[PDB]
Design a protein around this nucleic acid. Structure first.
Lengths: 167, 158, 300
RNA sequence: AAAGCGAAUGAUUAGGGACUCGGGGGCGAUUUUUAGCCUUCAUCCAUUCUCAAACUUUAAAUAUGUAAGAAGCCCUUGUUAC
RNA sequence: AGGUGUCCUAAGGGGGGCUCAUGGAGAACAGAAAUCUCCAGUAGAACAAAAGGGUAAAAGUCCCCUUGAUUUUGAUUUUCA
RNA sequence: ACAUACGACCAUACCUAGUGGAAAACUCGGGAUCCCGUCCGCUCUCCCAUAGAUAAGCCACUAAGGGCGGGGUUAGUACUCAGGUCGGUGACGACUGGGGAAUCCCCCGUGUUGUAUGU
């Protein structure tokens, strides 16, 4: 039986950790806008360590999240670079997965020498329909044990959809 | 040696075990009139209108009623004489007292119980009396044969 | 490897919250300020107007607090609005105004102040409050009540204020301000007074039909399936609600009957007992353990 | 006061089971990215021997507040700027 | 066994949304430790300072508007005649 | 009896795992012009009540479940008020007239109820 227990993509969130503030970070945020079409949001360093050369309350990273068909398309471009091969340790106990790429211009953005080269990180969240129960303000509750995704189920979904392979 | 307003109240003003959090809401629905009998019990959570630690446990009589507080009259024992004290307490600390309910219950029953006898014409013996010594009776040993006991010899347990 | 946080000692020290807060239905911090009254006024009650929105209904009540529970003075739903000529859009903003007016007229007749305190009697997009009505060579103060919005967010133009507006026009006095009504511009801190009138009579949903039909025919057909079946058009919406208001004042106690199966009160009790389940007795529960022992022993 | 620690914080003696990549020393080539074979600390779980004026889920004896009416109880209905 | 002769235009007043310390599993450079995501989490965090009490749709945290830290005098509680 | 809205006592109601749910109600759900709010209609807010489904929330039952509530034992024991020209070098102990607890361990139970509308 499986009437309304079909998996889907809840959201895709992707971030760049430049590691140091300045004009370099601003250029990195410039890169991320045209990929998604939305303004990104910065992040601040909550620790303060001299070995990494970062202090408190200075912007060191950017990220953005996408949903719907746009997330479906952008995920396809990333998997093309990975040629649809992922390692078994890329799937968490919850049922999510992610990976990273060293070069952001491997897919075309019409490279410009002024902006430079950046490395990007990928992560996506699975879900099932009717998960609003745990997030509505009124009469919030907790979803059942039988209605949550496991690690084995999500890798089966990935192989069946993209015809990819696991190592 | 110091004397502050809340000195020595480590255990008196604290809430009990597994009783922190929300105050039960039926407290604010009670009503008071002058002449009522109330007793004081300080609640730790409410930090406004707290009486001095001496009155935590005493019983008094309401003499004034206001928007969110009542005035209570209590008698304090200074050396060799008594003094009248008047305090203002928020309603989160006061509580109606069952001290006088036994008296009010007994007067109502007596009036009705005396009325019915006067119509009938028999003495009532309404006023109470202490416990009296027991009366003579008989105890049978049919199917209740007594069993003999004796002290036990010394023995080491451990 | 780390400490197991949820061990047997964790449960013993655990203190649970209020039962109605565990379910998330009430806010005791706000409730205390709504129901408490000054001890100068001894037994004068405080009247609340609670509004709750479901998927396919609107609930309104007049409630007074008591030491052993709440007491309901008068109740009005959206099912009963069908008997007055409304069959579509039962949870739009305009439907809230109608059911808000029904309760206000329903309570005044209960305590005999219907003849006086008539209200506006002609809806208009103006910010007004009910005042004292002169009678018998004297002045009588109006009935007073307050609004309980529960956990709903109080943004501009929310339906919770629609019930407030409807009851205010009925004759009851409810203190409020106009900065949350639709058509209020935060920049000029002024109220349009014309958007409000249009938005009372269902004008906003009427403009949706004509706009959707030209741009997207198939979507307009799917969303408004039931509107087409009873051939009610955008032009006819305003006269439909205006006529409904007249019948509310004429007779607020008109009874509505649904199409659900109906039985007597006692027969329903017998029907539910058929599907009830009986708890296992102590002897039966003990006997299962021996059966469990025998079969568990035989696999190995 | 007494009591408690297979109940929170703090102190404290001893074995057993499960684990290796937490640290240390070996073995089969100290081969070792061999979750091999050993093991010494560390960790986790079910048990065990003793304590607390400034620790506690519980909790006495002795002492302590109020009340036991005629200024009481009940019924009817005059005043007011609350 | 310890503390005080101070500090604050907000660290005062009102309202709204959110929940902490820590642990488990994951992601290019990234490591014990930098940023992101999910689940568990009765306070084990925080609240100017010594210690004690108190607080979870808050008394913690961020956001919006403000100066009840204002005027005229009386009754009451603690040290106590 | 059952369901929904507002409550009272505030775990006999909490936590973990497994099965079932007539009628209606509740829920998931569809859309983003209008009110409103976000990096993103996730949340909040508006419009629709057709269609699909009880998968989850919700209700009920099961487990020699953890916890919680009531009771028996430990025990007339520990302790304690009054008394003697009572014992003992002391530490301390016995007796006379009274009051009288707490673990380990064992057994049972798993919410009750007020107002309004409807199945």
């Amino acid at each position: 039986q499986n009437p309304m227990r079909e998996l889907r993509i809840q959201k895709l969130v992707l971030n760049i950790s430049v590691g140091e503030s300045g004009d370099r970070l601003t250029r990195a945020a410039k890169v991320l806008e045209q990929l998604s079409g939305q303004t990104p949001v910065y992040s601040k360093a909550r620790y303060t360590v001299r070995q990494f050369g970062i202090r408190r309350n200075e912007k060191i990273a950017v990220h953005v999240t996408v949903r719907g068909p746009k997330a479906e398309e952008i995920l396809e471009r990333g998997l093309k670079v990975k040629e649809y091969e992922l390692r078994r340790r890329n799937f968490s106990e919850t049922g999510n997965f992610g990976f990273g790429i060293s070069e952001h211009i491997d897919l075309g953005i019409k490279y410009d020498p002024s902006i430079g080269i950046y490395g990007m990180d990928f992560y996506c969240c699975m879900t099932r329909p009717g998960e609003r129960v745990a997030k509505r303000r009124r009469c919030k509750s907790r979803i059942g044990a039988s209605h949550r995704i496991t690690r084995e189920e999500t890798i089966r979904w990935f192989k069946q959809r993209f015809d990819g392979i696991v190592r | 040696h110091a004397a502050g307003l809340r000195s020595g109240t480590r255990y008196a003003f604290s809430r009990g075990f597994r009783k922190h959090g929300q105050i039960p809401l039926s407290t604010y629905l009670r009503t008071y009139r002058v002449g009522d009998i109330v007793d004081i019990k300080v609640n730790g959570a409410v930090q406004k209108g707290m009486p001095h630690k001496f009155y935590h446990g005493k019983t008094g009589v309401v003499y004034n009623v206001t928007k969110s507080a009542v005035g209570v009259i209590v008698y304090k024992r200074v050396k060799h004489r008594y003094i009248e004290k008047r305090i203002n307490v928020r309603i989160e600390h006061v509580k109606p007292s069952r001290s006088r309910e036994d008296f009010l219950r007994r007067v109502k029953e007596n009036a009705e119980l005396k009325k019915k006898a006067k119509a009938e014409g028999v003495p009532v013996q309404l006023k109470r009396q202490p416990a009296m010594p027991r009366e003579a009776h008989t105890v049978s040993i049919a199917d209740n044969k007594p069993v003999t006991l004796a002290p036990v010899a010394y023995e080491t347990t451990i | 490897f780390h400490k197991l946080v949820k061990n047997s000692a964790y449960y013993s020290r655990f203190q649970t919250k209020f039962k109605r807060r565990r379910q998330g239905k009430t806010d005791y911090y706000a409730r205390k300020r709504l129901i408490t009254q000054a001890k100068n006024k001894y037994n004068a009650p405080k009247y609340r107007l609670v509004v709750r929105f479901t998927n396919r209904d609107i609930i309104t009540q007049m409630v007074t607090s008591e030491i052993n529970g709440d007491k309901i003075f008068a109740a009005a739903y959206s099912h009963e609005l069908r008997a007055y000529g409304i069959n579509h859009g039962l949870t739009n903003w305009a439907a809230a105004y109608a059911t808000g007016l029904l309760l206000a007229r329903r309570v005044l007749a209960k305590l005999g102040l219907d003849k006086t305190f008539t209200g506006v009697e002609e809806p208009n997009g103006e910010y007004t409050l009910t005042e004292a009505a002169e009678t018998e060579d004297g002045e009588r103060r109006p009935f007073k009540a307050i609004l309980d919005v529960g956990l709903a967010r109080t943004s501009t133009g929310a339906r919770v204020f629609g019930v407030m507006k409807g009851a205010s026009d009925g004759g009851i006095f409810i203190p409020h301000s106009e900065n949350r009504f639709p058509g209020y511009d935060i920049e000029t801190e002024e109220l349009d007074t014309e958007v409000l009138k249009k938005y009372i009579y269902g004008g906003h949903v009427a403009e949706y039909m004509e706009t959707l039909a030209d741009d997207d025919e198939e979507r307009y057909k799917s969303q408004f399936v039931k509107y087409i079946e009873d051939d009610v058009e955008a032009d006819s919406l305003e006269e439909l609600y205006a006529e409904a208001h007249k019948q509310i004042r004429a007779d607020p106690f008109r009874k509505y009957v649904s199409d659900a199966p109906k039985k007597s009160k006692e027969e329903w009790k017998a029907e539910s007992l058929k599907y009830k389940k009986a708890k296992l007795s102590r002897e039966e529960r003990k006997a299962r353990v021996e059966a469990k022992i025998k079969q568990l022993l035989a696999e190995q």
